Ligand binder design. Structure first.
Ligand SMILES: C[S@@+](CC[C@H](N)C(=O)[O-])C[C@H]1O[C@@H](n2cnc3c(N)ncnc32)[C@H](O)[C@@H]1O
Length: 287
């Protein structure tokens, strides 16, 4: 995986001198490595809920092991993790939402619709709920709500939910693709820019990982973890996600928005990492 919009992350996070940075979604360690290379005196507390990517990050960040520490914990519990480390506040907070390319291409958890894999989609394999259980057992009306809300399928959510039910029991990513294909007319599939199953897969993933609920709850209080002048930078890839960030930054009384308009990748930043496409970066400062 290649770090998305690393230049803008560094620009807004302002890692310098001996700042302490909380990387809420360390993943394979891409952004963290860039920060450590850019700032020799900084310290990073990196967290993720996926132990498999933390293994990757620990090896990738080897050369900086004395200045970065990794932990398996949800950012919703970052406040107490910091306390157990003797840290009350940090100078920077970074969040890169979504899925790591390794999670997409190498974990065999069915995050992707491109190859046949089990319907798992858990970022934390220790959690109980799987995409398979959700798809095979949730009431049809709830599936419709999820696809409409998290998938943003504003016209076909009910029909996609109906096809999922008609295709039960589902077992692989290809079974889900089949359900979505049967729900969308040929002209609609062709009309779309991204693969037609993209939104439905996203909706199930977000539900399984409580991605929007976690983000909303964390961002409400994130400001309390920042030292004066501290920076919080978030990269979203979902309109509903970006809206939550935008709104949270706006409604905060302790944060001064630094990006009225979302910072987007340059056509070139897109090449250096096609994952950057759909990426919207927002930043704010503790005042
Ligand atoms: C797009 S990836 C991060 C990529 C990373 N910035 C890089 O440069 O390698 C998003 C990450 O957030 C993690 N994640 C998801 N929910 C989380 C949560 N509640 N707390 C912490 N990490 C979480 C995922 O497991 C995934 O590793």
């Amino acid at each position: 995986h290649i770090p998305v919009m690393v230049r803008e992350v560094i620009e807004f996070l302002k890692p310098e001198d001996e700042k302490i940075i909380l990387d809420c979604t360390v993943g394979e360690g891409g952004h963290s490595r860039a920060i450590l290379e850019h700032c020799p005196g900084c310290r990073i507390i990196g967290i993720d809920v996926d132990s498999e990517v933390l293994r990757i990050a620990e090896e990738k960040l080897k050369e900086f092991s004395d200045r970065v520490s990794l932990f398996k914990v949800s950012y919703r519990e970052a406040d107490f993790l910091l306390k157990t480390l003797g840290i009350e506040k940090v100078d920077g907070i970074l969040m890169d939402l979504g899925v790591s390319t390794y999670q997409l291409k190498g974990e065999n958890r069915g995050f992707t619709f491109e190859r046949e894999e089990p319907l798992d989609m858990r970022m934390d394999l220790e959690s109980e709920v799987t995409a398979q259980k959700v798809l095979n057992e949730l009431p049809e009306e709830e599936l419709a709500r999820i696809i409409f809300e998290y998938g943003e399928e504003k016209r076909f959510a009910r029909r996609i939910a109906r096809k999922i039910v008609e295709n039960r029991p589902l077992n692989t990513t290809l079974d889900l693709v089949k359900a979505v294909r049967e729900a969308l007319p040929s002209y609609e599939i062709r009309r779309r820019k991204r693969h037609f199953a993209t939104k439905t897969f996203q909706a199930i993933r977000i539900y399984v990982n409580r991605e929007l609920e976690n983000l909303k709850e964390f961002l409400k209080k994130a400001e309390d973890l920042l030292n004066p002048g501290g920076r919080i930078v978030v990269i979203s890839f979902h309109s509903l996600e970006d809206r939550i960030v935008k709104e949270t930054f706006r409604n905060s009384k302790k944060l001064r928005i630094l990006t009225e308009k979302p910072v987007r990748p340059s056509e070139e930043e897109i090449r250096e990492n096609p994952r950057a496409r759909s990426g919207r970066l927002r930043a704010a400062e503790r005042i």
